[PDB]
Amino acid sequence: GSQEKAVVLDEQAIRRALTRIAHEIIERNKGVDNCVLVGIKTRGIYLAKRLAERIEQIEGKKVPVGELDITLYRDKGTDIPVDITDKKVILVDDVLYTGRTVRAAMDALMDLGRPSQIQLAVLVDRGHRELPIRADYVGKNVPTSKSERIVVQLSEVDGQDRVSIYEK
Amino acid sequence: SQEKAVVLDEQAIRRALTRIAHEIIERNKGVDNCVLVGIKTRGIYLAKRLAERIEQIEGKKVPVGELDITLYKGTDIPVDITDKKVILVDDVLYTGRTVRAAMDALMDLGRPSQIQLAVLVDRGHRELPIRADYVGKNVPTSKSERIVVQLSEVDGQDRVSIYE
Amino acid sequence: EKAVVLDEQAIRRALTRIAHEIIERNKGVDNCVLVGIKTRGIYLAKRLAERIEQIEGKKVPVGELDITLYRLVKGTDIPVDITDKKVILVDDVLYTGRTVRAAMDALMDLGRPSQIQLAVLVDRGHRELPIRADYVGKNVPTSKSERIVVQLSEVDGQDRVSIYEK
Amino acid sequence: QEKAVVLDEQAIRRALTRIAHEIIERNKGVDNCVLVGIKTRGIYLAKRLAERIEQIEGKKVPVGELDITLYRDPLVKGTDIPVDITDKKVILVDDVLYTGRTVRAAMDALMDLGRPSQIQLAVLVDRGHRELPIRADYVGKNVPTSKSERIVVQLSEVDGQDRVSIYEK
Numbered sequence: 001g002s003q004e005k006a007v008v009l010d011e012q013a014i015r016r017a018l019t020r021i022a023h024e025i026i027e028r029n030k031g032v033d034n035c036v037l038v039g040i041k042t043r044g045i046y047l048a049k050r051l052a053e054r055i056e057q058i059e060g061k062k063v064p065v066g067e068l069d070i071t072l073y074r075d076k077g078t079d080i081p082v083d084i085t086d087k088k089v090i091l092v093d094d095v096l097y098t099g100r101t102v103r104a105a106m107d108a109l110m111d112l113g114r115p116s117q118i119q120l121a122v123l124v125d126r127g128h129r130e131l132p133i134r135a136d137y138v139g140k141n142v143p144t145s146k147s148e149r150i151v152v153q154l155s156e157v158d159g160q161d162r163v164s165i166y167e168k
Numbered sequence: 169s170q171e172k173a174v175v176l177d178e179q180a181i182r183r184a185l186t187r188i189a190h191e192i193i194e195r196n197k198g199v200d201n202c203v204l205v206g207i208k209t210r211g212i213y214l215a216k217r218l219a220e221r222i223e224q225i226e227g228k229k230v231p232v233g234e235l236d237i238t239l240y241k242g243t244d245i246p247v248d249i250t251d252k253k254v255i256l257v258d259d260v261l262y263t264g265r266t267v268r269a270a271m272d273a274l275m276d277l278g279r280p281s282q283i284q285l286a287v288l289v290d291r292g293h294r295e296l297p298i299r300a301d302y303v304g305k306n307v308p309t310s311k312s313e314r315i316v317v318q319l320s321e322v323d324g325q326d327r328v329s330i331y332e
Numbered sequence: 333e334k335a336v337v338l339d340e341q342a343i344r345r346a347l348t349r350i351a352h353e354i355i356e357r358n359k360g361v362d363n364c365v366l367v368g369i370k371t372r373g374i375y376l377a378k379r380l381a382e383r384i385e386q387i388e389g390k391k392v393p394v395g396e397l398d399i400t401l402y403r404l405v406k407g408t409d410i411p412v413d414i415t416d417k418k419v420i421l422v423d424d425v426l427y428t429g430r431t432v433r434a435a436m437d438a439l440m441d442l443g444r445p446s447q448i449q450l451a452v453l454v455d456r457g458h459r460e461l462p463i464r465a466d467y468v469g470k471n472v473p474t475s476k477s478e479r480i481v482v483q484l485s486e487v488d489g490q491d492r493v494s495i496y497e498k
Numbered sequence: 499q500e501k502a503v504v505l506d507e508q509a510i511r512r513a514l515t516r517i518a519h520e521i522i523e524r525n526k527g528v529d530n531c532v533l534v535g536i537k538t539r540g541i542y543l544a545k546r547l548a549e550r551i552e553q554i555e556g557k558k559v560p561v562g563e564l565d566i567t568l569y570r571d572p573l574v575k576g577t578d579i580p581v582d583i584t585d586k587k588v589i590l591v592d593d594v595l596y597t598g599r600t601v602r603a604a605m606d607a608l609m610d611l612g613r614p615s616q617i618q619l620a621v622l623v624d625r626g627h628r629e630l631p632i633r634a635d636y637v638g639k640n641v642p643t644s645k646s647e648r649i650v651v652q653l654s655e656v657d658g659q660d661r662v663s664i665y666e667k
Contacts, residue, residue: 132285143473308642
């Protein structure tokens with residue numbers, strides 16, 4: 001839809017969620033040795049870069065960031081600067097809806113290499129999964145109806161940081 | 169390896185599977201356009217048990233298919249799965265790599281409208297972002313343990329244990 | 333009325349599922365007592381006792397608590413001693429958790445149960461206390477300007493759960 | 499004796515830092531929040547969290563204390579909360595959540611002192627086996643245990659080291 005129904009994360013809430021996710025990643029992996037962030041185009045890639053910056057500030061370690069170009073089911077090229085074999089790949093996307101985009105991303109990764117794990121971080125989980133896929137790290141669970149959509153704006157691409165529900 | 173604990177006896181297995189049958193009916197609002205697909209030997213028997221239980225509850229026969237997948241390939245699914253809700257059934261969810269392969273096989277056969285996952289045991293230690301929709305029992309384990317699932321059809325008794 | 337979130341078949345499927353969860357988690361229903369929070373919680377409890385009986389061939393005793401719903405304990409009517417029993421408290425909707433907090437305190441005045449479990453048809457979010465249901469029919473997202481209305485046939489003439497802007 | 503270490507010192511630090519960020523996130527800052535620790539180790543965890551939150555947000559959250567016999571091993575012995583909690587968000591802090599009986603008693607004590615807007619719960623460890631419908635909002639680690647085990651939390655301020663272990667007993 002075209003009408004903003006609710007703002008569900010403002011700029012500050014986005015920052016607080018990403019910071020908390022960074023801390024989770026570090027906590028669950030016990031540091032970030034052998035981790036690679038891989039963002040899904042376009043907004044996922046910017047979120048991955050933000051997480052890498054935050055992690056570097058927290059831990060003093062640089063996590064490499066790769067990119068996947070995938071058509072988003074919700075609405076097939078690769079650029080990963082390190083070998084992912086035996087690494088822990090943390091996929092990053094803005095919104096988890098059906099899970100079909102993540103399924104395709106997993107398949108791509110598993111063609112490029114044999115990671116030891118693939119984790120998933122998303123800014124929003126909006127429900128309505130169609131595959132048995134779940135994010136390891138979630139910024140905000142945002143309930144939605146099927147007629148609603150999530151709009152993520154990020155300052156790098158869109159001029160402001162905002163997440164909204166839009167409705168017809 | 170020695171047995172370290174028993175985590176589900178025969179009655180607990182029966183209770184978990186009956187509850188899972190009721191969850192499947194509940195979440196899908198009936199079982200129209202659903203298809204159960206069992207993974208490997210024990211997932212297939214669990215799928216059959218769930219189909220029999222669902223038939224008794226709802227009076228509808230859900231088709232049961234099979235997938236043969238190597239242990240972390242062949243398929244036998246008796247209906248078209250395009251636009252159907254496929255409920256994959258496995259005995260244990262560990263890394264998620266078997267399920268990832270199973271999803272691949274399914275997508276090769278057809279275009280299901282969704283894929284759900286039912287397991288008797290989730291033992292943690294996922295290596296992919298895969299979760300079961302329906303779980304009999306969450307069984308915490310260390311990496312130096314394994315789950316052993318016995319089902320009467322092939323093993324003589326219904327039991328789940330931790331070994332190692 | 334904004335959205336019907338459970339119709340009659342969905343209510344039946346949720347309560348049947350909850351009965352099987354209760355039997356599963358308790359490994360049967362020996363030494364269990366259902367206690368409903370008046371009025372709709374009491375009918376839900378009775379439905380659950382009827383389902384459990386069909387499954388297990390045991391009739392779980394059903395008690396009642398009369399409590400002002402935050403969304404004060406006025407009276408209790410529990411037909412068995414609850415000391416060393418597993419009490420399953422039943423309400424229609426979990427919102428803040430303040431009512432359940434008051435119910436727990438009442439129960440603990442009437443006896444020393446081994447445990448207190450909580451079954452609710454709907455969890456609408458917005459907790460204000462660290463209270464969670466063990467058994468939930470449906471998680472129903474709501475805003476603070478909305479309310480959940482539950483109708484059960486025995487006392488309200490139909491089975492329906494809706495969100496109202498109220 | 500000791501069966502397994504489940505959080506070492508670095509894992510305790512990382513959990514508490516993460517929890518501080520969760521507290522800030524969920525409450526959108528820490529305005530009108532009050533941390534209340536359960537003795538003996540919950541209070542030190544509350545003070546750690548307050549120090550972390552001050553570093554992150556620049557703001558000092560007041561810390562109170564509750565002295566309660568711990569069911570896991572309830573009587574409310576005493577309270578010492580330095581601000582009024584009416585209409586505030588109280589974040590109760592304990593080291594281990596087991597049956598929930600202690601928290602139940604803590605909630606009662608809080609309600610005797612004031613009318614908080616909400617009561618949140620942070621614990622370092624949730625070891626399962628609840629006997630009441632109580633759950634923590636913030637958890638350091640979910641630690642599966644059997645009924646024949648206990649959790650032992652050591653904190654440097656009380657015990658001379660930071661460690662969480664499972665013991666047979």
